[PDB]
Design a protein around this nucleic acid. Sequence first.
DNA 1: AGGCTGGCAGCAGAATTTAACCGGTGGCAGCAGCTGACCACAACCGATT
DNA 2: AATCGGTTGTGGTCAGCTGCTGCCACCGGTTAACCTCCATTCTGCTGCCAGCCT
Lengths: 49, 293, 263, 107, 49, 98
Amino acid sequence: WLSAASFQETTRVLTDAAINCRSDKLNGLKENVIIGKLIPAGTGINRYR
Amino acid sequence: GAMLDVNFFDELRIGLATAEDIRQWSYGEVKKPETINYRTLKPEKDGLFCEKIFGPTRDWECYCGKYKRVRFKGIICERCGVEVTRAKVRRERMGHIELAAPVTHIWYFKGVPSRLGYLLDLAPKDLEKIIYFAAYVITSVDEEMRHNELSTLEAEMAVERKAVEDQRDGELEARAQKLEADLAELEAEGAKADARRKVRDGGEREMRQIRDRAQRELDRLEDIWSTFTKLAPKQLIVDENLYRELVDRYGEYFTGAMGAESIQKLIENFDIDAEAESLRDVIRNGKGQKKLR
Amino acid sequence: ELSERGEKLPAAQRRDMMWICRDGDRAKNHLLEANLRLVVSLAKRYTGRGMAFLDLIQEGNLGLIRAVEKFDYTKGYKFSTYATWWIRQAITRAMADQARTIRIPVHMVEVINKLGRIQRELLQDLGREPTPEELAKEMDITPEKVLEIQQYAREPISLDQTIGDEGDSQLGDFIEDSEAVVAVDAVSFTLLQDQLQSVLDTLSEREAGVVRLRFGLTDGQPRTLDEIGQVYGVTRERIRQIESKTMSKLRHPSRSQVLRDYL
Amino acid sequence: VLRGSRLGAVSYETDRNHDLAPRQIARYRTDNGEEFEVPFADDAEIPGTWLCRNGMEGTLIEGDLPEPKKVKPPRTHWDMLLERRSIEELEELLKERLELIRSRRRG
Amino acid sequence: NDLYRRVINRNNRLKRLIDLGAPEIIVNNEKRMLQESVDALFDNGRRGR
Amino acid sequence: RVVRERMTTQDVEAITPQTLINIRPVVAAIKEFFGTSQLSQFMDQNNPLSGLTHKRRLSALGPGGLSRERAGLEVRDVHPSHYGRMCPIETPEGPNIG
DNA sequence: AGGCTGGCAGCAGAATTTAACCGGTGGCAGCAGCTGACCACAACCGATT
DNA sequence: AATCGGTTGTGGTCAGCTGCTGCCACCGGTTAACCTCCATTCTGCTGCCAGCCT
Ligand SMILES: [Zn+2]
């Protein structure tokens, strides 16, 4: 939900992420940029890190 | 889970905050529309910038200056109530406003598709009229009392309509007496043969309009009776006068309200499992606009 | 009063009285509903300065409730004659309380409106914007009081308005936070703490302890000479004398050259 | 260049955790049964009532203080009526209304 | 602060009207105004001007 | 509007034009046109050509005319009725071309 | 005799007018009247090497 | 002879309440001829009305 709300239609995405009580496992490349940790690509993966 | 946010997050979960969540996040109720003093430029108590609610403006001081170091850290001044701590807690502490009447959230009422309308099965036009105080809605009805007093109330309505028609019969007799007086005072005196019929035509117009008044009043009584016999919850009553006649005659057997307090009573009397089961039966069996809806 | 300490009345009389008790409330509601249109026509004059139209109507309705309560029918006047005073007072006092973000009280709003009328009359009849001396002589106050009132009469600008014309940049993106950590003052204070601790460390133990407990360099609490004297078992004047001699030692160039740059 | 200050101070101290002043904890109770803990200073007089986080006053939990009294409104509709009428005039008005409703219903 | 102040002003006036015992025309007009002010706080211009 | 509004209150045969007229809205209207409007611009003074070309400028945008994002690609064109009336060459090259 | 379903058209969201008294109370603000502790210059001691 | 600590004669001194004595902001209540209503494009949903079926 956190990378779909920042794409577009923020109000519509947030108003049924709340109704469905959605949870965000922060797996993506954009959710790690927003919350401020290492993206899961490049040198930020556990093989290299 | 975490609230200080030291960076071991596993998940971020979103949901729908209830009133207990809101008044559990809050550090105090704001109850004045004041911001700062116009002379001393310092925050006002209970206002929108209050230090007793949101924390102090200066690092490790209270509001009255009684406690002013890190030696007094974490205590609350017994005079002004300001907890002496950092001033950056005024970016972290929330407060709340306790409403005197319930209010709907605009996100769940307005934006297409209306989620409140889908849950309660009300059209958005019929939902706007309720929550913006333009129509009534039947929150509850009583079926046992209605089914056991329907005959007696039918007898009462028939008695009252009989009285109305007897009143029209008395008017029929009185205007017939005036009409026969007009006959005796027009046919036995010399005038125009058409002008003796103009007064009786006005009398017949008076009879037509008076029986039209009686017919419209009888139609209004039939409308009240049919509206009470077809009463169910989630049913809009525009015509404030029709609603007032209903609460006058049959003030038991049902309840009604306007606004978000009626919307929240409809949500209280809502059976999510039964509604989901009936919707799944429709999508298994039926077809068309019913199945798509 | 009768239902206080019991005293049961006849039930016919009790049913008789309750009818007029509810009829009084019906009458009061009828009077208010009849004069709501007067409230609206009276309140439409104040639209356009701060408050919205429906807020003005509702504060007028509170005033109309008090005009119903204080109305005396034996004086033989109309209701609207008496109620116009209370409706106008309620609308004007509510506008004084609720028009601005930073709230100015009613008496100061009254002198601001007075100064506004005076200034408009002088600009009309003088052909020129009047001086503070002319305003202060027309209004019988001092020429600095005019400027204090005129600076209390200023409304805030908005942080969220577009200050550009094409870049779509708001005002709040142009205001420097003048209370953030400057990140070189915060490290200079750290190195000052370390250097001051070194210079104090190269004195004697009790001589450094006297200065540290005197200036509160350990716990932020500057103690007094008698407290340090009972700490070290010494008297107040001897504490003051050794403090003066340590200040003489610390004022040396060999100690203060490394600290001159930190001022 | 615009430069503004939200009118507060920022102090440069080391936030320690050990040498801190002593505190005592009171406990209050509002009229719907909620309970709150307030850390006062040890050398300080604990107040009788405290405005808590619900925005409603809560009394101190220890049964010592006979403090709250009546602060009654001197302005009700009955008071505003009484300052412009008399008891005999109101009694006459009441008896005239009673006689009218007797003549209406009973007659 | 203006949107929050509208909510607090209309809420306090509604408390005054309810404890004053005003007729339902006045009380319902106050409730409808309180509802529209909270709507304008959350999403301004979504419903109305 | 203020003339009518304070014409109804004041007693007739006691009023005069300088008691009816409040010139403060006229003064404020002219003042807020000349400062803070889109079409009242800071004069381009680099050289005499910048100055002379800031006058003799026909701008299609402003209060009462079309926006920049909501303007179509058809009003940004050169039309054969511009011959002798508007220059086909001299126009901005940014997002204001035409 | 009625009815419930098919296109069909319209609408919403998202992207690039007017003032004044009067009472009363809490906060302010300034200033002797003590202070009561602080500061200090100078002088007078209590053993002690 | 000094030297580390007390005693203090005595003279300012310096702010900390303490009355105290105005005095000045601040807030509530009152006023009684009479006059009563404010750009374009795409997508999806919702309501409209004819048209075959029992
Ligand atoms: Zn404090």
